[PDB]
Amino acid sequence: CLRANLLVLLTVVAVVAGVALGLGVSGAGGALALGPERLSAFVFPGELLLRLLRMIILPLVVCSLIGGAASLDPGALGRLGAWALLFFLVTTLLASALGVGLALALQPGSKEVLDSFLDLARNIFPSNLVSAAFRSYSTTYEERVKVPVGQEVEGMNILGLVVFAIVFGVALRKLGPEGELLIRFFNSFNEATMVLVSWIMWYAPVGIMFLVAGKIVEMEDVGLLFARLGKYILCCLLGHAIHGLLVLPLIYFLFTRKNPYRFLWGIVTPLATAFGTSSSSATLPLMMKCVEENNGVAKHISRFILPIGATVNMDGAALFQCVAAVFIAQLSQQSLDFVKIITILVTATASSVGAAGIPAGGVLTLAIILEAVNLPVDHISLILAVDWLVDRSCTVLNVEGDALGAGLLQNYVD
Numbered sequence: 001c002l003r004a005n006l007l008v009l010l011t012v013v014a015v016v017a018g019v020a021l022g023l024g025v026s027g028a029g030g031a032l033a034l035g036p037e038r039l040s041a042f043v044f045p046g047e048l049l050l051r052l053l054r055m056i057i058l059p060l061v062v063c064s065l066i067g068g069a070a071s072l073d074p075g076a077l078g079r080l081g082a083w084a085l086l087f088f089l090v091t092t093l094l095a096s097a098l099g100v101g102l103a104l105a106l107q108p109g110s111k112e113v114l115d116s117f118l119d120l121a122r123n124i125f126p127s128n129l130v131s132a133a134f135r136s137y138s139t140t141y142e143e144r145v146k147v148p149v150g151q152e153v154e155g156m157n158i159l160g161l162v163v164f165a166i167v168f169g170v171a172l173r174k175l176g177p178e179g180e181l182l183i184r185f186f187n188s189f190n191e192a193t194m195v196l197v198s199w200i201m202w203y204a205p206v207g208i209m210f211l212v213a214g215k216i217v218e219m220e221d222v223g224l225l226f227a228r229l230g231k232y233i234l235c236c237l238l239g240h241a242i243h244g245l246l247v248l249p250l251i252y253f254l255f256t257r258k259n260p261y262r263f264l265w266g267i268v269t270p271l272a273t274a275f276g277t278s279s280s281s282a283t284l285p286l287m288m289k290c291v292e293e294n295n296g297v298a299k300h301i302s303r304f305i306l307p308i309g310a311t312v313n314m315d316g317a318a319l320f321q322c323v324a325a326v327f328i329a330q331l332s333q334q335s336l337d338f339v340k341i342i343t344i345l346v347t348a349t350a351s352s353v354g355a356a357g358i359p360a361g362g363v364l365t366l367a368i369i370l371e372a373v374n375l376p377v378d379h380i381s382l383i384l385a386v387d388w389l390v391d392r393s394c395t396v397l398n399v400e401g402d403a404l405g406a407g408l409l410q411n412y413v414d
């Protein structure tokens with residue numbers, strides 16, 4: 001059909017065929033018939049796609065952000081970043097409010113908060129760049145009265161690398177003629193990483209198919225999960241659909257006076273990749289590639305906004321956290337007042353920034369949100385029963401706001 005629409009069709013067909021294949025395998029026995037020896041082989045292609053996507057996050061993010069920050073005047077870059085941060089904050093607040101409202105209407109029913117925010121601040125300013133390339137600071141507790149002791153756990157410190165890349169790009173821009181060589185070096189490295197991303201996009205349909213097939217094979221008795229948490233799943237999915245098809249497109253159309261669904265058509269493939277992988281960081285390379293090629297977004301604007309948006313802007317995470325918090329409060333028959341709603345919204349918005357963009361990443365912040373609202377923590381056990389689905393529906397939105405943000409900021413630049 002094309003070289004950019006054929007990929008979209010192949011990815012959609014891959015998602016549909018993965019769902020069909022997973023249902024067929026589950027009907028034929030699923031995990032019991034296959035066993036771990038065959039389940040590992042069955043789900044391996046999706047793991048391979050995830051590994052390929054994760055391998056290119058660090059060079060792509062670092063080089064793209066250094067080039068983007070070094071390609072703009074410090075005042076212009078500061079204004080663009082302030083506007084992007086305001087847009088991200090407003091969209092996250094809207095997502096949280098929508099989630100709380102839908103949870104209140106449809107009625108579906110550890111680490112300290114300060115330590116979590118201190119860990120976020122520590123991750124913003126990493127103590128080592130090489131270590132931050134594969135580790136993140138995390139605080140555990142010891143019984144010396146609990147005392148917080150921090151150490152580096154596995155997991156790429158994307159936020160610290162983003163901050164360092166931005167400040168290094170600003171420094172390169174301030175250098176002048178002396179930094180032009182490094183700007184060229186990082187631009188060339190990012191171009192090569194884009195070539196690798198374009199190659200990986202062709203394997204992406206197979207990986208997505210096997211990812212969704214294995215995901216719906218592993219968690220068997222899906223009908224029982226629906227019979228248990230239908231209202232909660234409906235609240236989460238309806239909130240994500242409203243935010244990604246009604247609220248964010250309305251904002252895009254109001255600010256740019258352009259069709260937002262044509263914008264979403266060009267990023268359908270990274271959206272399906274996000275759904276398959278349930279991680280914004282891994283689908284970020286495909287997001288940048290599709291935004292730059294399929295959409296008329298500027299190279300520097302995309303390379304600057306999309307990594308920051310992937311790290312920080314998470315509408316789906318905030319929406320899921322708010323819906324889960326209200327659902328757990330309803331399960332405990334805990335009445336929620338106006339102040340309770342406000343603190344729920346604020347905590348969800350703050351935690352969405354600190355999310356690491358990895359599968360099952362909202363559950364970690366859910367506990368801190370419930371602690372802030374003094375809601376019980378045991379009921380999170382129910383969420384993990386269906387989180388594997390809900391998180392996926394989050395990731396789509398978590399990237400969908402970023403791209404629509406960039407395309408919005410493009411109109412601001414033009």
Ligand SMILES: NC(=O)CC[C@H](N)C(=O)O
Binds near residue numbers: 318356358361391
């Ligand atoms: N529930 C969530 O949104 C957690 C983060 C999600 N896995 C992402 O990468 O966007």
Ligand code: NA
Binds near residue numbers: 089090091313314
């Ligand atoms: Na947002």
Ligand code: NA
Binds near residue numbers: 280
């Ligand atoms: Na994001």
Ligand code: NA
Binds near residue numbers: 313314351353
């Ligand atoms: Na985040």
